[PDB]
mmCIF file with all atom_site columns, C-alpha atoms in Angstrom:
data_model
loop_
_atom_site.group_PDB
_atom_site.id
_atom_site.type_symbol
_atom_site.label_atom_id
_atom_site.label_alt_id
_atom_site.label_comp_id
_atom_site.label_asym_id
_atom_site.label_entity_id
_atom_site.label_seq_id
_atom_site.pdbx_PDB_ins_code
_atom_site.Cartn_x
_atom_site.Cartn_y
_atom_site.Cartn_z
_atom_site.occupancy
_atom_site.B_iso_or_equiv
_atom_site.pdbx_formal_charge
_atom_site.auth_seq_id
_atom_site.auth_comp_id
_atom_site.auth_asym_id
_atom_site.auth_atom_id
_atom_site.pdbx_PDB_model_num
ATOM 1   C CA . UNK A 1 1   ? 62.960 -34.639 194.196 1.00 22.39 ? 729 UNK A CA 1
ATOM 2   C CA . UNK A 1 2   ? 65.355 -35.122 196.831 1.00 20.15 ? 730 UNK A CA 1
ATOM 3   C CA . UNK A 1 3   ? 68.397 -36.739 196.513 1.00 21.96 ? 731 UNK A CA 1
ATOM 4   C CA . UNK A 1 4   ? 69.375 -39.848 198.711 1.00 18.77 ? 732 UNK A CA 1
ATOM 5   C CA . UNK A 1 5   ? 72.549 -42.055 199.661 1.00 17.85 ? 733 UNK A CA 1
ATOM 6   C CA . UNK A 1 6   ? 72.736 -45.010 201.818 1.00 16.86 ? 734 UNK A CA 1
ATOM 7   C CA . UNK A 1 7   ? 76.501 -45.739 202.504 1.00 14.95 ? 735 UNK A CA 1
ATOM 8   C CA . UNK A 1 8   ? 77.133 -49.093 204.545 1.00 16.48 ? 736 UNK A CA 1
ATOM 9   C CA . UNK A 1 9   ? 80.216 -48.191 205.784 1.00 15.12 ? 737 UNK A CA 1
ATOM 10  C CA . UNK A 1 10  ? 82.769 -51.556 207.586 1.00 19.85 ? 738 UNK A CA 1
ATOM 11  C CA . UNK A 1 11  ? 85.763 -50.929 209.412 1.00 16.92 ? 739 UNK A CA 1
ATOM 12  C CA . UNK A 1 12  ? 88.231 -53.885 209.052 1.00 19.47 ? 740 UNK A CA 1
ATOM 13  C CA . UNK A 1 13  ? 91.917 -54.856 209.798 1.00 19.34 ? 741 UNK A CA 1
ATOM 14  C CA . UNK A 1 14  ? 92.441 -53.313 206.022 1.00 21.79 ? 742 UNK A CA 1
ATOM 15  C CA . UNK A 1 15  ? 90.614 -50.435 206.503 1.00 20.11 ? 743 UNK A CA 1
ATOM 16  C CA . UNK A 1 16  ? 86.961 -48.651 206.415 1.00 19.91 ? 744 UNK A CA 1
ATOM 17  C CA . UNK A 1 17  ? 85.217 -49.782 203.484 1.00 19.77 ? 745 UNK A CA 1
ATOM 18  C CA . UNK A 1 18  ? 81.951 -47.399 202.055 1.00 17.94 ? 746 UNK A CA 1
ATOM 19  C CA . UNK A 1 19  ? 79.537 -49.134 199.318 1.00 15.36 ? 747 UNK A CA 1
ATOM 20  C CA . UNK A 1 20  ? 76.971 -46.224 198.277 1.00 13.42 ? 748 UNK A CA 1
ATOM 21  C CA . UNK A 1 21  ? 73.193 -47.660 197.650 1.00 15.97 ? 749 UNK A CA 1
ATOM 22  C CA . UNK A 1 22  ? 70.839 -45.231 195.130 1.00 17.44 ? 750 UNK A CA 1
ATOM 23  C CA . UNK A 1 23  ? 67.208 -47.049 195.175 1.00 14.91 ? 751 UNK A CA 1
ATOM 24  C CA . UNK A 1 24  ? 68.465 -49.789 196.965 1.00 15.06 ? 752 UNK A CA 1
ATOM 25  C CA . UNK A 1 25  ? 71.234 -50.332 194.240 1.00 8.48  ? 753 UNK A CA 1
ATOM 26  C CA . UNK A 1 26  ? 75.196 -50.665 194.456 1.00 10.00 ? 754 UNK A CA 1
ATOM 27  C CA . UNK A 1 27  ? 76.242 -47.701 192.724 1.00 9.48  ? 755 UNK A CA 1
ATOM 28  C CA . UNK A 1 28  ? 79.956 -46.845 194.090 1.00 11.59 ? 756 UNK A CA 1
ATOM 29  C CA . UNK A 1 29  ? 82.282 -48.019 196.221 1.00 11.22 ? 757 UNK A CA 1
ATOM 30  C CA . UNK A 1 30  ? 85.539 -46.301 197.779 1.00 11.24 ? 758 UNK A CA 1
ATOM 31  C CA . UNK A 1 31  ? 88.086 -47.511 200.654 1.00 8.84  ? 759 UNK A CA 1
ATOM 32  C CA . UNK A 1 32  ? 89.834 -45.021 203.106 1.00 9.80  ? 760 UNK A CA 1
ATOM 33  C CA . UNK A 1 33  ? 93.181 -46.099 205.107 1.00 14.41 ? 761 UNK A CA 1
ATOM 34  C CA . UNK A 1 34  ? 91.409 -45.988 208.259 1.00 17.52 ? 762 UNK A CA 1
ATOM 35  C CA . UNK A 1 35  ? 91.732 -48.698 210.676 1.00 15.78 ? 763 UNK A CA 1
ATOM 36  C CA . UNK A 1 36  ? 90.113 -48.327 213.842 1.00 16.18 ? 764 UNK A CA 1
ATOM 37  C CA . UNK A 1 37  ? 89.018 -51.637 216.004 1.00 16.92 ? 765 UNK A CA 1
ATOM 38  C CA . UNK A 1 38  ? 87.013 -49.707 218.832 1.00 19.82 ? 766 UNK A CA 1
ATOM 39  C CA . UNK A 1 39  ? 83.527 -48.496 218.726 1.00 19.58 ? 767 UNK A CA 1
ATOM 40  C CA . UNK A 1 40  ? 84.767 -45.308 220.964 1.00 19.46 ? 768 UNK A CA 1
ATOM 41  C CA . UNK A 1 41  ? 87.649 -44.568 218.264 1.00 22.42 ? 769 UNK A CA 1
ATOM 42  C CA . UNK A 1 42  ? 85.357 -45.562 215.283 1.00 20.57 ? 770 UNK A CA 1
ATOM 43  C CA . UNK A 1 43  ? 82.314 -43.285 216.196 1.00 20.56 ? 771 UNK A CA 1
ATOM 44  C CA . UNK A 1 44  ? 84.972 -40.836 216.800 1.00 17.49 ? 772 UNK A CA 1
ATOM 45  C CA . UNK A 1 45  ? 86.157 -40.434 213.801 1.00 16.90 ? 773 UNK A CA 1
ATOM 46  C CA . UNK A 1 46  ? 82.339 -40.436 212.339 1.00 18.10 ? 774 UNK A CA 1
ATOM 47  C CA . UNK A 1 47  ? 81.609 -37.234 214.155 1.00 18.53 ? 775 UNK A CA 1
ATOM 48  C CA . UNK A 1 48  ? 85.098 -35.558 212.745 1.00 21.47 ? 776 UNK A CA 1
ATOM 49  C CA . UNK A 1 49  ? 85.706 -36.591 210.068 1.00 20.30 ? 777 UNK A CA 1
ATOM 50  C CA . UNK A 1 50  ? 89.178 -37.931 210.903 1.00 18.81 ? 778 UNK A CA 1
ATOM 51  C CA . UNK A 1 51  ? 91.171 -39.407 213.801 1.00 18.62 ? 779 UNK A CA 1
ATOM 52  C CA . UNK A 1 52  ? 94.811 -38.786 214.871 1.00 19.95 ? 780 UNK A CA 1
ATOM 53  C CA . UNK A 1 53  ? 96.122 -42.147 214.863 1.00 20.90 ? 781 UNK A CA 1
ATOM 54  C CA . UNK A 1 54  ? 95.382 -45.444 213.830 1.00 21.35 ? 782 UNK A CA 1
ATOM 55  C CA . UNK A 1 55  ? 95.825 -48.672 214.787 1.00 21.91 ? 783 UNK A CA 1
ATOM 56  C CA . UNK A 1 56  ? 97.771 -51.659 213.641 1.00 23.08 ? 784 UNK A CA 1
ATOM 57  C CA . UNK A 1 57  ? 96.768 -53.835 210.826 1.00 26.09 ? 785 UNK A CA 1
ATOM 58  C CA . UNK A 1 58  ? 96.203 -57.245 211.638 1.00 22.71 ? 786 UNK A CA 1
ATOM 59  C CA . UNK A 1 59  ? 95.415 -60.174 209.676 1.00 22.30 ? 787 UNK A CA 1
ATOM 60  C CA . UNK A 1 60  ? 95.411 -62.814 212.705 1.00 21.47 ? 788 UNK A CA 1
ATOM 61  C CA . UNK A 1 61  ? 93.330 -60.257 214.451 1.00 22.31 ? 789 UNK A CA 1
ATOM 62  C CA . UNK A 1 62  ? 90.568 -59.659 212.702 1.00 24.20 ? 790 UNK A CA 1
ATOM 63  C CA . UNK A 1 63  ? 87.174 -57.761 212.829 1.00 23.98 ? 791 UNK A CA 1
ATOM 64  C CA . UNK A 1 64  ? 84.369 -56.411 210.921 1.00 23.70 ? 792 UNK A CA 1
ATOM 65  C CA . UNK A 1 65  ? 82.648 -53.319 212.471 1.00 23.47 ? 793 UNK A CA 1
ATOM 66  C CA . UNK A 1 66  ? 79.377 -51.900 210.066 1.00 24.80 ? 794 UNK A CA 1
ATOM 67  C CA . UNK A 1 67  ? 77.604 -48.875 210.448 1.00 26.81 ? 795 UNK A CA 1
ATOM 68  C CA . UNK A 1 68  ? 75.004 -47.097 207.993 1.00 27.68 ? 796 UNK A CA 1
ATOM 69  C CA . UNK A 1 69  ? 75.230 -43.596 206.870 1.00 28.15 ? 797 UNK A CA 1
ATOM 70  C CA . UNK A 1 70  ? 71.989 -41.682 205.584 1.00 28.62 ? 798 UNK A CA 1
ATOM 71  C CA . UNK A 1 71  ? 72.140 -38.331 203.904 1.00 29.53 ? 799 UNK A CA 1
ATOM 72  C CA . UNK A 1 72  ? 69.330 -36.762 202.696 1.00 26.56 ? 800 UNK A CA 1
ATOM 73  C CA . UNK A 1 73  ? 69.171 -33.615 200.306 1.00 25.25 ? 801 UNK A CA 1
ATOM 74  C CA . UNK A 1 74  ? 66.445 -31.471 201.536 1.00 26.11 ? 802 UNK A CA 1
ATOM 75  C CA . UNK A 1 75  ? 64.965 -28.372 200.048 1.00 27.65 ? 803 UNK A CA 1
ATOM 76  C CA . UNK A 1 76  ? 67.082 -25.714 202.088 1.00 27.77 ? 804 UNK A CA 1
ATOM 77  C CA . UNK A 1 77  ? 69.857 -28.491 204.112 1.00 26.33 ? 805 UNK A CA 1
ATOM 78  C CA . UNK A 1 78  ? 71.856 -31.516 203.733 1.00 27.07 ? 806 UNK A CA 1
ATOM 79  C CA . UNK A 1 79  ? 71.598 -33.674 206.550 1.00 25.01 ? 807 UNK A CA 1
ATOM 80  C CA . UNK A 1 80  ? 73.973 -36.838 207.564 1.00 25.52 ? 808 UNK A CA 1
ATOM 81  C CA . UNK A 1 81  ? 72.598 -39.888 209.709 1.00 24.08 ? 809 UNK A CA 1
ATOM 82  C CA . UNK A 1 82  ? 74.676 -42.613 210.925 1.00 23.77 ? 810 UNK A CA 1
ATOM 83  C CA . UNK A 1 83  ? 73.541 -45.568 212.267 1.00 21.41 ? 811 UNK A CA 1
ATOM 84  C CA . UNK A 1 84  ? 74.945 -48.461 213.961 1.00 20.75 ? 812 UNK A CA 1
ATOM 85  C CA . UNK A 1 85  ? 74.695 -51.673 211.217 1.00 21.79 ? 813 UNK A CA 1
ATOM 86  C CA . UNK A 1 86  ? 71.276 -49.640 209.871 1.00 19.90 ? 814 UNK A CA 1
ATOM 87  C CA . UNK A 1 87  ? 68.820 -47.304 210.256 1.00 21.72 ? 815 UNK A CA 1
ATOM 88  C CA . UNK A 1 88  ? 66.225 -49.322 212.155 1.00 23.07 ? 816 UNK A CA 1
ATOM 89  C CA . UNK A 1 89  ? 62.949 -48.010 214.160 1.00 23.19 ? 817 UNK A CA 1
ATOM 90  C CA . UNK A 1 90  ? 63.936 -49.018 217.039 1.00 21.48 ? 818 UNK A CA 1
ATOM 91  C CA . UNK A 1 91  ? 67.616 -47.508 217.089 1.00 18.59 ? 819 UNK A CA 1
ATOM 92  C CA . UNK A 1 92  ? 68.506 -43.963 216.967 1.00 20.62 ? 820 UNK A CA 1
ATOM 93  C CA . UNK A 1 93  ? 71.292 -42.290 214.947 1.00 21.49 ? 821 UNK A CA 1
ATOM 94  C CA . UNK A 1 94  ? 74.951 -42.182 216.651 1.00 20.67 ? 822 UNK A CA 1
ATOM 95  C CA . UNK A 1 95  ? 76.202 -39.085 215.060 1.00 19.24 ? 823 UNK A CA 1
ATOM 96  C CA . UNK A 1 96  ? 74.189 -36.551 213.464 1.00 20.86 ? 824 UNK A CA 1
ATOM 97  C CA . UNK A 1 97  ? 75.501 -33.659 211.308 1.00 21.41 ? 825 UNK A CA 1
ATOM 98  C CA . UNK A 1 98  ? 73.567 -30.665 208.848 1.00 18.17 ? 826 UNK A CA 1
ATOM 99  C CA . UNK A 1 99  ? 75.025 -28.202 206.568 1.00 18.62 ? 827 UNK A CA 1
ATOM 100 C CA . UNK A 1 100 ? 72.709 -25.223 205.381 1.00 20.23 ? 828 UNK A CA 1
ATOM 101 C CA . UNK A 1 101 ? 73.554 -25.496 201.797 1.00 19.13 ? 829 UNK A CA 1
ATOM 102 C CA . UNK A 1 102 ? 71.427 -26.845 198.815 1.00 21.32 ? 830 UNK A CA 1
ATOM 103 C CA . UNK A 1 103 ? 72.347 -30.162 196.746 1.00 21.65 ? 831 UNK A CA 1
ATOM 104 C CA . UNK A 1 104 ? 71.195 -30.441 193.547 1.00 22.20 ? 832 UNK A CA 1
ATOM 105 C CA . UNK A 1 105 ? 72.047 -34.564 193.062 1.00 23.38 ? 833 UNK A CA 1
ATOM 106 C CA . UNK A 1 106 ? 73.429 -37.390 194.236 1.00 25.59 ? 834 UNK A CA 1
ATOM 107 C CA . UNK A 1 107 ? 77.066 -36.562 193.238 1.00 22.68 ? 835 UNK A CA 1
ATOM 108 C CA . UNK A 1 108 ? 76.841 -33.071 195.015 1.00 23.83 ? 836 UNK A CA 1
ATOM 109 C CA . UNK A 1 109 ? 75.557 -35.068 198.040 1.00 24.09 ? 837 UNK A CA 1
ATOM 110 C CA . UNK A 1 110 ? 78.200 -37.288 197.900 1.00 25.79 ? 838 UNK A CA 1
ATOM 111 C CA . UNK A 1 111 ? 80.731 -34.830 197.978 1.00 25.22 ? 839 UNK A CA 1
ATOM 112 C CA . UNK A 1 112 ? 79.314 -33.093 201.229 1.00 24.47 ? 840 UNK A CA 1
ATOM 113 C CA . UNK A 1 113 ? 80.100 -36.400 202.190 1.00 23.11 ? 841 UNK A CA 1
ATOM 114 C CA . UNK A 1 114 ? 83.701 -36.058 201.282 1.00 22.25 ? 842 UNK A CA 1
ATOM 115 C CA . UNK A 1 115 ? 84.339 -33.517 202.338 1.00 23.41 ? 843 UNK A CA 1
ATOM 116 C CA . UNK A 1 116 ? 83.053 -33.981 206.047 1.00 20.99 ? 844 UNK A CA 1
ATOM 117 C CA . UNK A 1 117 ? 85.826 -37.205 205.971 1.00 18.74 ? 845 UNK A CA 1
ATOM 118 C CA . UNK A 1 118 ? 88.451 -35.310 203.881 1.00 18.72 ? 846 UNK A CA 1
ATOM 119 C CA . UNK A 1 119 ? 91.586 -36.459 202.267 1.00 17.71 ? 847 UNK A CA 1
ATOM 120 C CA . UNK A 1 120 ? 90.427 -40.164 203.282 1.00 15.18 ? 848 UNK A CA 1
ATOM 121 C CA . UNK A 1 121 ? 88.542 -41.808 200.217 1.00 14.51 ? 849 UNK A CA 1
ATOM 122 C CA . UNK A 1 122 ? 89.934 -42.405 197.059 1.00 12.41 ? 850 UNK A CA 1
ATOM 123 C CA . UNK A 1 123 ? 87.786 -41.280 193.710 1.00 13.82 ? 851 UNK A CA 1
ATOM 124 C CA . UNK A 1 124 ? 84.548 -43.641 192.974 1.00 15.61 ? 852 UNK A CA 1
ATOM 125 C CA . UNK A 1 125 ? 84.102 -46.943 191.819 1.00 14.43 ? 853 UNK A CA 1
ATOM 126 C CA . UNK A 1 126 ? 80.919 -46.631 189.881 1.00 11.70 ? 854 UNK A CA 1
ATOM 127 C CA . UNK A 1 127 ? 78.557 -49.207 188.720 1.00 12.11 ? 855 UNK A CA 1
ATOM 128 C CA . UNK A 1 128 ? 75.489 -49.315 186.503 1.00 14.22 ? 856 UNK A CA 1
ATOM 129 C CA . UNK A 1 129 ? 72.622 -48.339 187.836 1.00 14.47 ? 857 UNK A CA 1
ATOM 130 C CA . UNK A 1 130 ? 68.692 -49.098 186.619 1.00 17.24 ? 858 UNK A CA 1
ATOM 131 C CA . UNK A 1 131 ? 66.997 -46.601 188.341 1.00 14.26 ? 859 UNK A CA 1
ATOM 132 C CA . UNK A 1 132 ? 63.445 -46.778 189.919 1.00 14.19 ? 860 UNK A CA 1
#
């Protein structure tokens, strides 16, 4: 096997919303306080995992900014892909990131995950799931 999560990730005026596909099926969702309008300050915090300050909420200033990550739990690594809107052939990733450790399942991926954007989501919204 190896273990696979698509996140489509949207930064908003409310904050960055992450919906986690399994098979091409909603299986979580989580929201993080983070509220970034510009690419610069949104890719940013992508690469470390947090960013110092944030900008202003505002509802009569909107916008909706998407990005896709990919991780991928390989035989020896755990990688992280992030693409702008989605992984397309055409379009390379914007950040790229690796950790030499070994992940047994989608929940251990996930929390490499987590852990690269600490203390920002709150615990998983999880939905059924009919895999394969």
């Amino acid at each position: 096997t190896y273990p696979t999560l698509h996140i489509l990730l949207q930064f908003n005026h409310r904050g960055l919303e992450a919906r986690i596909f399994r098979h091409g099926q909603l299986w979580a969702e989580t929201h993080a306080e983070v509220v970034l309008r510009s690419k610069t300050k949104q890719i940013s915090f992508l690469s470390n995992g947090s960013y110092p300050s944030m900008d202003a909420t505002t509802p009569l200033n909107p916008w909706k900014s998407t990005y896709q990550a990919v991780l991928r739990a390989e035989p020896h690594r755990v990688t992280m892909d992030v693409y702008h809107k989605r992984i397309r052939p055409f379009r390379l990733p914007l950040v790229q990131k690796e950790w030499r450790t070994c992940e047994e399942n989608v929940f251990g991926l996930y929390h490499v995950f987590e852990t690269h954007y600490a203390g920002y989501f709150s615990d998983l919204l999880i939905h059924d799931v009919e895999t394969n």
